[PDB]
């Protein structure tokens, strides 16, 4: 009975058998791409066209309508902004309009919801019927008072861990599997934090600077 036990198991289809075949063209100087990893900038409209045409060729086409270039540029910028928003949301407060539209990304207003004063201020200062400077100054002071953050603190610049957590949580900002899967692994291999010895040298250097200042 045992021998015919593992003959009908699952055989996943190798993903490379359907890999695209690569054909070599003439090596010219004019035929260049400027992938953004090489030039640390977003590609301009002209630069994008060179690689768009090159890719189109391997699929048996002639040229690009030149309205496609604009759409692709706009989409790339939009997508990058979406990812940036996802990362930002995890370390700053914000407001909501109509239930989803997030605008004010500072950490200021955020009325603490457990204060009787906050409960009263929420009903009025939020629902405004849809501003002399003295009145606005008073109300700004009130909003800062209700926030509760007596001694606010700040964060270091955005590093790898923030990106990793943001990507893991939301995950609807990269619907396509190919883009997400390949880049998440790359992100993992760039996680880093200074170890004990480096912190010791930071200690020593701080002592040195304090001394030379006195």
């Amino acid at each position: 009975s045992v021998r015919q036990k593992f003959d009908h198991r699952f055989q996943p289809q190798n993903p490379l058998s359907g890999a695209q075949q690569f054909v070599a063209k003439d090596p010219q100087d004019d035929d260049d791409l400027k992938l953004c990893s090489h030039t640390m900038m977003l590609p301009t409209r002209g630069q994008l066209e060179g690689r768009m045409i090159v890719t189109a060729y391997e699929h048996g086409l002639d040229n690009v309508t030149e309205e496609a270039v604009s759409a692709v540029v706009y989409a790339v910028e939009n997508h990058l902004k979406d990812i940036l928003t996802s990362v930002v949301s995890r370390r700053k407060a914000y407001r909501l309009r109509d239930g989803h539209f997030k605008y004010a990304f500072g950490s200021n207003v955020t009325p603490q919801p457990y204060l009787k004063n906050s409960v009263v201020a929420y009903n009025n200062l939020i629902e405004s019927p849809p501003p002399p400077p003295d009145d606005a100054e008073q109300q700004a002071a009130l909003l800062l008072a209700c926030s509760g953050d007596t001694l606010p603190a700040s964060l270091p610049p955005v590093n790898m861990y923030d990106l990793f957590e943001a990507l893991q949580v939301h995950r609807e900002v990269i619907p396509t599997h190919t883009v997400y899967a390949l880049n998440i692994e790359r992100i993992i291999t760039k996680l880093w934090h200074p170890n004990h010895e480096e912190l010791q040298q930071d200690k020593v250097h701080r002592q040195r600077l304090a001394a030379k200042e006195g």
Binding site: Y114, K116, V119, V120
Partner: protein, 99 residues
Amino acid sequence: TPLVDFLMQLEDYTPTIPDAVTGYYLNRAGFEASDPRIIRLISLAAQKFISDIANDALQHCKMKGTASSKDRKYTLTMEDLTPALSEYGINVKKPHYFT
């Protein structure tokens, strides 16, 4: 008439969802289920989620037969749930008969 602070109000809101269910769900994520405030708030959020779907389903049921009265038994069919659920990216497609 009164405007007591939020924690005074919360002690009066009774949730339909029992506390043990919320404890079950909190234990999955690795939390000690002993704080009454957290249980209340989670149960209330779940209740709101279900209530919105119920309201939309009843409205859709009302609109269904208009062209071509009040005293009638309101029953719930999948054709009422599907559009209401689709508001939340839930695509309901269920078979009818097999072979």
